[PDB]
Ligand binder design. Structure first.
Ligand SMILES: Nc1ncnc2c1ncn2[C@@H]1O[C@H](COP(=O)(O)OP(=O)(O)OP(=O)(O)O)[C@@H](O)[C@H]1O
Ligand SMILES: Nc1ncnc2c1ncn2[C@@H]1O[C@H](COP(=O)(O)OP(=O)(O)OP(=O)(O)O)[C@@H](O)[C@H]1O
Ligand SMILES: Nc1ncnc2c1ncn2[C@@H]1O[C@H](COP(=O)(O)OP(=O)(O)OP(=O)(O)O)[C@@H](O)[C@H]1O
Ligand SMILES: [Mg+2]
Ligand SMILES: [Mg+2]
Ligand SMILES: [Mg+2]
Ligand SMILES: [Mg+2]
Ligand SMILES: [Zn+2]
Ligand SMILES: [Zn+2]
Lengths: 257, 164, 257, 257
């Protein structure tokens, strides 16, 4: 059945090459090249994770015969209230090593030698505000002692925790702000969703002013609201047998927000 | 509760010659169990960590294999086939590997620990007793998660061409 | 004795196919189909728990011997001040996964594996305001790392809790409002209770204007108060050898509120 | 339908480019260039708020590719009895930053941080008389420590509040007076409303002396009365099937003042 494959597609995620993503990638290239620590900050659902995650796919590991793999960028997301030992485990497991026993010092030491063993140059810590306060000390040590571009990612909650340790505030001082969408750029993102994400058999003219009106009120510029609204509206419309999003279905979705 | 669900656990099929240390390690990883955890779950306590090192004073008893055969759904007669048969002398320390077998079946074979075994008759290769690339000794078969040397990361399947 | 069997029946609980339940179930089917996380909100005793509990039976598991069960809908009510370990315990105990001991790290990793292996597609967290603020991070990760619609159920206290964390707020902002009964809907529900729930030997005619007036004052439209009043009124009537709810017995019960 | 579309338009608000708007904008441009603090004072419903809104829309935030926006003009209206934390929350949210939970000192330091880097040149505080007297100290500190032109807006009630504190009075000494309309300026303003705001199918002839007489008596020069009388009169007239305002409907509305 054709319907099942479209719904199975529309429920899944996709990556759209927004200029907001290109901005971070060129910027992260500068911080990685300069081997510079920094932070990424912005409101929820602005796309920080997807842009950082896409950057890791852009620099997949490399190998040589009889050598460990080399991993230019590591991307990790700590669990909430991440203590030092579990951060070392996160880094260790991303590098496919294992450490079954040891003190926290032994986990740290094994982390240092596997980081420099794989020769990583940038470490992105997504939702870094999940780190315990003491874990930022070990993050600072990994930054300085080995010369890794550490990139902390979070919301304004990350700025609030970084202000509580002068040594973290100092070495993570450089930052990039993720903005919300607005103006014609939001509109351009709406049409990019219509043609590169929705791909429905008939066009919906979501770029039209009357569609943009309700979308702007419901999305408010969050790319996560845009994606979640349009995918549900498309799924609902196909379930109703429509070949497109209708304004009435888009209204029925937007009423829930 | 989930209605009409039977209390269940993640299972693994034992390979034809897989050693008990290798098997328990896979079962533990399939359930994210520590070695102490499985022993507490079977009620035999710290004995599991001892078996995973092939420390078999005493050997795995009928009682304890039948206890492990309660949490693992593999029966105790098949668990006894994961161990040397009666009177076959075995060595625990030098852990050994054929590599060409590991490319066909990703398990440690208990026969690689027998004091009478030195070649793989199937492959006609001298079995390895350390990594041929970097000379690191192999870890206990319970810890073969990666299927590669823990030092130089050479996969065991590639060490097949570094044999005999 | 027949009386003892009528009391054993009337003291119990049943599910009546109200339109509110039908409305929720159809809505959950869309959210499950789209894998969209959302919330159900409505004041106390409006039938949210009964309607959500009815939805899991409508998707009861399928299992083969020696396999994880296919369980499309997981339903949990956390205990008060639920931390992350208790969250993982609730989920794995619902799926009847046998490992009940381990660290929070093991419980996390086993839970994510169990959710994936059982093919879960919707997770309903009833009284989700009982979750600790740190454990909402694990709830968000279930919704992001797995294609799972998470449904948070609660009273308006849940709306307050969600607004204190922008990351939860922007994930769970699609909502359904459960209502109280009023007017003709209440009158329709009163007659369904007599014929489907009470099933007394003789018609009480609770549908009548004067009985409806008593019920309207005492119930205030709460379906919980309707059920609790009419069952107790039936039990009192039957215990005194009445064949129906009499006016005087309904008034005796109503004046307790 | 025609009628509901026209009613939905007239129900709303719009900005007319009155000369007093341009006068304020050129004056605010001078004050912003000099970073000079000042006050805007005028009778209620003379148009101060709309003219201040029009200014910050002409000087909206500018993006610079992953930097925080350059936002030269901040506009806030404090809620009644605005304390210092409320004031800092107003400013921070305008700059598209989320207020993390913390002390007044954390809010102050974060606000002071983001007023820099966003490059704020002018802060317009509308209904500045809603500020608590202790909140003016923090407003003065923003003007003193950052090079920011703070503009207090209010009615003559602001001019009394300010004179209760010499340190505030002596900083906001420079002022602009917003006036009422009269004379030829009022006659032109009526002409502009007919053409640019009401936009009825047929000319209402509101420049006529008999129409101006009605309007001048009821409007008394308040642009707020002019707008809300003429919109309501147009809505009443269209609802009656008239294609213009007429004297009878206009008198019927004007009689309510
Ligand atoms: N570049 C993108 N292409 C396609 N979809 C995107 C993109 N960025 C964001 N989205 C959509 O928005 C959602 C939220 O984005 P993302 O996961 O990056 O959030 P975030 O900014 O890291 O938020 P938070 O700080 O709340 O964790 C995505 O899961 C996806 O649905
Ligand atoms: N569909 C129904 N059929 C029969 N009885 C119902 C139904 N819905 C509610 N009830 C009755 O109302 C009581 C309260 O309903 P329920 O537990 O679902 O409320 P709730 O909205 O989840 O409340 P709270 O928010 O206070 O936890 C039930 O225990 C039962 O007596
Ligand atoms: N430039 C304008 N263009 C169109 N309508 C205007 C304009 N200025 C004022 N109005 C009308 O007058 C109303 C009152 O104006 P405004 O809100 O700016 O008053 P204000 O001076 O800030 O009053 P107050 O001191 O009572 O708060 C507006 O809501 C609108 O109806
Ligand atoms: Mg993220
Ligand atoms: Mg020896
Ligand atoms: Mg409940
Ligand atoms: Mg005003
Ligand atoms: Zn072999
Ligand atoms: Zn090696």
């Amino acid at each position: 059945e054709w319907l099942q494959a479209e719904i199975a597609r529309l429920k899944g995620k996709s990556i759209v090459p927004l200029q907001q993503v290109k901005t971070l990638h060129d910027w992260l290239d500068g911080k990685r090249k300069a081997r510079k620590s920094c932070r990424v900050v912005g409101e929820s659902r602005t796309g920080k994770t997807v842009a950082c995650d896409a950057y890791r796919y852009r620099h997949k590991p490399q190998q040589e015969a009889g050598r460990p793999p080399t991993v230019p960028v590591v991307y990790i997301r700590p669990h909430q209230k991440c203590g030092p030992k579990d951060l070392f485990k996160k880094i260790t497991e991303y590098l496919k090593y294992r450490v079954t026993k040891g003190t926290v010092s032994d986990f740290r030491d094994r982390t240092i030698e596997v980081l420099k063993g794989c020769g990583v140059e940038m470490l992105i810590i997504d939702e870094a505000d999940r780190l315990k306060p003491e874990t930022f000390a070990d993050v600072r040590d990994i930054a300085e002692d080995l010369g890794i571009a550490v990139v902390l990612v979070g919301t304004d909650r990350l700025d609030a925790v970084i202000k509580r340790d002068e040594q973290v505030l100092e070495r993570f001082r450089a930052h990039l702000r993720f903005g919300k969408l607005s103006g014609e750029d939001f509109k351009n993102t709406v049409e990019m969703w219509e043609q590169m994400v929705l791909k429905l058999p008939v066009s919906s003219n979501l770029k039209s002013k009357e569609m943009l009106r309700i979308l702007t009120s419901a999305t408010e510029g969050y790319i996560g609201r845009l994606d979640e609204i349009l995918r549900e509206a498309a799924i609902r419309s196909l379930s109703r047998g429509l070949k497109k999003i209708d304004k009435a279905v888009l209204q029925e979705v937007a009423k829930e927000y | 509760e989930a209605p009409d669900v039977k209390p269940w656990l993640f299972l693994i099929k034992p390979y034809e010659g897989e050693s008990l240390s290798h098997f328990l390690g896979r079962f533990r990883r399939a359930n994210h169990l520590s070695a102490s955890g499985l022993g507490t779950l079977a009620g035999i306590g710290a004995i599991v960590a001892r078996w995973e090192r092939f420390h078999f004073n005493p050997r795995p008893s009928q009682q304890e294999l039948e206890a492990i055969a309660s949490v693992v759904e593999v029966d105790a007669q098949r668990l006894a086939q994961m161990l040397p048969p009666a009177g076959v002398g075995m060595q625990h320390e030098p852990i050994r590997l054929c590599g060409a077998c590991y490319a066909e079946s990703p398990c440690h074979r208990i026969e690689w620990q027998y004091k009478s075994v030195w070649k793989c008759d199937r492959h006609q290769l001298k079995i390895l007793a350390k990594c041929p690339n970097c000379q690191a000794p192999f870890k206990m078969p319970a810890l073969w998660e990666d299927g590669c040397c823990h030092r130089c990361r050479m996969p065991f399947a590639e060490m097949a061409k570094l044999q005999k």
